[PDB]
């Protein structure tokens, strides 16, 4: 006998079994690292996708500046990625989109973003995945580096009493001109502080479904953080009004958008015409996005608005036009038998270049020019997972194109675009004009760096396309974005972790990525994970743990075992229809009044605020 766990794909669909192809969600045990070699290859491919050779030495660093925008050369083999942008076409697409949506559209959006920012407290910056400290020269949460920055400002030139985003930004600006800056103790000069602020570090974390292509996800500092937040707020306020923008949210709304698009298409295209689909996948969405074009676009946007926003939105772009990249850990040496092994940093690899291998050498000499001490003065690109909203806006601009050359042939297109993944819908009345339309679309996309893959982009007739793991079909729309919690990594508190997991499961059910039985199994699994995390078990069990000895000793004094808490030898009572309801609210009237008041005693040494917190 033999086996083939794909034969079930013959007499069945794919929307029902595709999930079996990918493993279950969770932390990737791959340990995708951020080494120096990978970073250098990235920088090389970046400078290369720039099809130009022009430069201009600066005055603040005495360093060249590869200006890869509006200077296209090396037209040969242009099917491969490109980064040289054309401003004329960009502004033309922006104008088309404005005309379509409306005139005072960008103005209304920027006004909304402004007013939202005004009443915003700088403290918001504490909400972030991670950053890079410019004093300790490491990566940490936002709150830590924020405290560091504020206390350094205090130690050097008095405290920051703004308590608002705008004062914080202006304080950063002023600090750009300070000659001496202190911090717990040591100080630094102007140039070094500038560099540190414009420094970036490559993080190894890449956790998501689909593909973990984020080997070297960026990790900027704190100076540029607020301006990036502002630009993202504006781009978000913009993407909301756009029908073809699945970034800000997903699921129910996403399916609504899909079906709306499809139905509008079916009701629009003439009888003679016939549609098609393409499963596009933009390649190198981070090594071809330039902040200079973003700057010009933001300028064209705010052209008619308060000059405040005009100058503000023009901050993060220039901050990204000049971004020093921290090279990872330096190379190591070794003798033949490997009995001795030397370790050197990156800044000195230019000192022993004669030893490194060729592949590592040819990848290092051409860049030595741009090196200063240990970093590389990258004048462009976009590595961070930032400006995703803005990139999506640019893509939507790409899709809203239309001229008379197409109309004459009776053809057009439309579709949807995520950050770096999209779906196209072409229309024509011949099995050839479709090819012409596809080539036209690819050309307009390449004009502004937006490329497309060929080994990962396919197509088919109208019924079958894929978008953000949501394999759409004539029916049976199947999702695959099943998320889950993780206690060991995020032990916020005993009380709040189970309720949060219940809310998460409820959400996943809403998005149809989960079904009743699946949800129940996941619940019974997360309960056990929680228990094992906090080292707690029920009372029926014959455990001998440290919390358990006292819990087993104090069990005989109560009868409302049902009312007991999971954290205290309790049992489950919630179910599908009782997720929004915390177990506490569900056991209040049931807990023996003694235990109840003994828990809800605000006169204790320490979501329903329990006497179960881990400060």
């Amino acid at each position: 006998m033999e086996i083939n766990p794909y034969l079930m794909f013959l007499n069945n669909d794919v929307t029902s079994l595709i999930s079996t192809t990918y493993p279950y969600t969770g932390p990737p045990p791959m340990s995708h690292g951020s080494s120096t070699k990978y970073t250098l290859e990235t920088i090389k491919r970046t400078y290369d996708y720039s099809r130009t050779s022009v430069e201009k030495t600066s005055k603040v660093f005495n360093i060249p500046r590869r200006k890869f925008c509006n200077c296209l050369e090396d037209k040969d083999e242009l099917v491969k990625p490109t980064g040289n942008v054309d401003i004329s076409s960009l502004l033309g697409l922006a104008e088309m989109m404005e005309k379509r949506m409306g005139e005072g559209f960008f103005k209304h959006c920027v006004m909304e973003a402004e007013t939202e920012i005004l009443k915003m407290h700088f403290s918001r910056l504490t909400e972030g995945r991670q950053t890079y400290d410019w004093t300790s020269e490491r990566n940490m949460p936002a709150a830590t580096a924020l405290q560091l920055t504020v206390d350094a400002i205090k130690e050097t030139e008095g405290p920051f009493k703004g308590t608002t985003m705008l004062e914080y930004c202006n304080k950063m600006i002023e600090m750009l001109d300070w000659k001496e800056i202190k911090f717990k103790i040591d100080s630094i000069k102007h140039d070094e502080f500038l560099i540190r602020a414009l420094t970036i570090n490559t993080m190894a974390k890449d956790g998501e479904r689909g593909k973990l292509q984020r080997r070297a996800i960026a990790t900027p500092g704190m100076i540029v953080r607020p301006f990036s937040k502002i630009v993202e707020t504006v781009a978000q306020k913009i993407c909301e009004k756009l029908k073809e923008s699945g970034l800000p949210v997903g699921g129910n709304e996403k399916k609504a958008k899909l079906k709306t698009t499809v139905t509008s298409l079916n009701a629009r295209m003439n009888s003679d015409q016939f549609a098609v689909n393409i499963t596009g996948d933009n390649s190198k969405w981070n090594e071809c996005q330039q902040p200079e074009a973003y700057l010009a676009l933001l300028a064209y946007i705010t052209k008619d608005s308060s000059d405040l926003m005009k100058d503000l939105c023009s901050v993060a772009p220039v901050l990204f036009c000049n971004k020093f990249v921290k090279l990872g850990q330096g190379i190591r040496l070794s003798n033949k038998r490997k009995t001795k092994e030397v370790i050197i940093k990156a800044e000195k690899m230019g000192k022993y270049k004669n030893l490194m291998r060729e592949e590592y050498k040819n990848l290092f000499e051409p860049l030595e020019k741009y090196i200063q001490k240990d970093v590389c003065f990258l004048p462009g690109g976009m590595l961070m997972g930032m400006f995703n909203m803005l990139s999506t806006v640019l893509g939507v601009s790409t899709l809203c194109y239309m001229d008379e050359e197409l109309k004459a042939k009776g053809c057009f297109w439309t579709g949807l675009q995520s950050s770096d993944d999209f779906v196209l819908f072409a229309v024509a009345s011949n099995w050839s004009n479709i090819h012409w339309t596809i080539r036209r679309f690819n050309a307009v996309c390449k004009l502004i760096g937006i490329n497309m893959s060929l080994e990962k982009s396919y197509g088919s007739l109208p019924e079958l396309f894929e978008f953000t793991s949501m394999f759409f079909d004539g029916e049976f729309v199947s999702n695959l974005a099943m998320e889950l919690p993780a206690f060991t990594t995020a032990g916020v508190n005993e009380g709040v972790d189970f309720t949060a997991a219940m809310s998460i499961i409820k959400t996943n059910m809403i998005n149809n990525s989960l079904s009743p039985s699946t949800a129940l199994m996941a619940l019974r699994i997360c309960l056990q994970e929680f228990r094992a995390t906090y080292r707690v078990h029920p009372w029926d069990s014959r455990v001998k743990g440290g919390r358990m000895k006292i819990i087993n000793e104090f069990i005989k004094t109560i009868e409302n075992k049902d009312g007991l808490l999971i954290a205290d030898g309790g049992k489950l009572m919630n179910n599908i229809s009782t997720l929004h309801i915390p177990e506490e609210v569900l056991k209040f009237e049931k807990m023996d009044e003694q235990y109840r008041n003994r828990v809800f005693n605000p006169k204790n040494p320490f979501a329903v605020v329990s006497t179960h917190s881990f400060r």
Binding site: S16, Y22, P23, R65, S88, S517
Partner: protein, 525 residues
Amino acid sequence: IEMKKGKTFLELRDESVPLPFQTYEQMKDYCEKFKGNPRELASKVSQMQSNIKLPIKHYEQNKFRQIRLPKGPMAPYTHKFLMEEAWMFTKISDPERSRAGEILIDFFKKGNLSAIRPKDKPLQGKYPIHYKNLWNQIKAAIADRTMVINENDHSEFLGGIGRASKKIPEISLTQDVITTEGLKQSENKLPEPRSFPRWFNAEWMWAIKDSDLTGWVPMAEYPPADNELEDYAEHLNKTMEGVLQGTNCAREMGKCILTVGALMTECRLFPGKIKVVPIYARSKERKSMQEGLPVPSEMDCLFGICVKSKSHLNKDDGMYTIITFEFSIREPNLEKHQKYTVFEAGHTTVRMKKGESVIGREVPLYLYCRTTALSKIKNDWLSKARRCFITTMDTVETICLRESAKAEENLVEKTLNEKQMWIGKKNGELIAQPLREALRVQLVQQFYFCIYNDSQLEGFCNEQKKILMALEGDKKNKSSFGFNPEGLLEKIEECLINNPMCLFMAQRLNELVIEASKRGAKFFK
């Protein structure tokens, strides 16, 4: 009110600008007054379209091809433990001694371990003496009622075989020193390619079988119910659990769980120390020898032992090392068992029914020695192996609702007991089974995914999807079209090395396209 400007910022802003513009003001004026001239733009896009040669294939005139696999020796076993060739001693479970340190000591008391005395000469191995002396030290430590090992001579060696050397400061470096020591950049090694494994099918089949013992995996309780939905869900979950728990895959799952639960604690409370840990599992019920029905029988089982090296889990991405001493009653084969050093440890006994009594038939006994590393992330990933059930559940429910919705009625039992699913080929002919029996295959697939998880597998799974969608389109008479299939074939062939799961899946996928050629027109032979 306005954003008070500095100086350096303004200089940069006037510097970092497009080519023809050298000041923010010129660019700003050009932008705020940009007008639309669609004619020049159309000419530009047409010029770009002309100087581009975008190919568009239809998969019919230019079909796919069979994949070219690597060539060389067969891929060996990779997982840490043993699945099919394993063996275990048994004993009754005491809730007062339900811990590894106690279970191991109890197993040792009866003196069945002390009888394990491997001879000097092995069958196939590298460093037999170290393993043997370490086994003796393990027995000595257990006798002393402490799992610790004081002397650090063998463990140090076997942990340093990977990498161990001196380090010279860069400041103490010159050119003459270099020329003397012949220092160079440390060459980076690549994984060697391997061939197709010819033992995966056997393990899969064995896993599909039903185990004698049952209850390997523990689970939580079932909360109350308040309507028909929760009742149906509970019924389905109970059915699926009762179907799976008595499978040999569940045994390995529970074993991994209970062993990792102890290793994650030993790497936490005794870091930098050498400890001893068992490889055990716990059962709760069996099947009568006179009747094929279940019977309550709580019991413990010991498959082998795992030693621990110094583990701090805060440096070197939290890499640590272990050493495995597993039991087996099946002599090895040279290919599948390459990383294993083997011995012959006396004999043992096998027990089987005889009418109304039990008997015992002696057999030989083998000891499988192997070294391997781990990390914190792998621990967190294996401990969460129960999630495999969740994935299997989804597949079942996908089939059990769609149909139920086409006919608008409960068809759960009907489909589970009737709906036939292709599972494999026997004697050049397909084999089909009910869904209730294919759950096992789905679960084994998810488990193997959970084990051999790695970047290679990520790429394979991310790429095969396109082939699957193309095939589906072929089935339903849709002119699938692409741009560069051969490039995709290369993308997929480049990620095939020293990972048997990917190789098996690739071979079976080729077989699938072959079989479908009888009804499809997008694949070569």
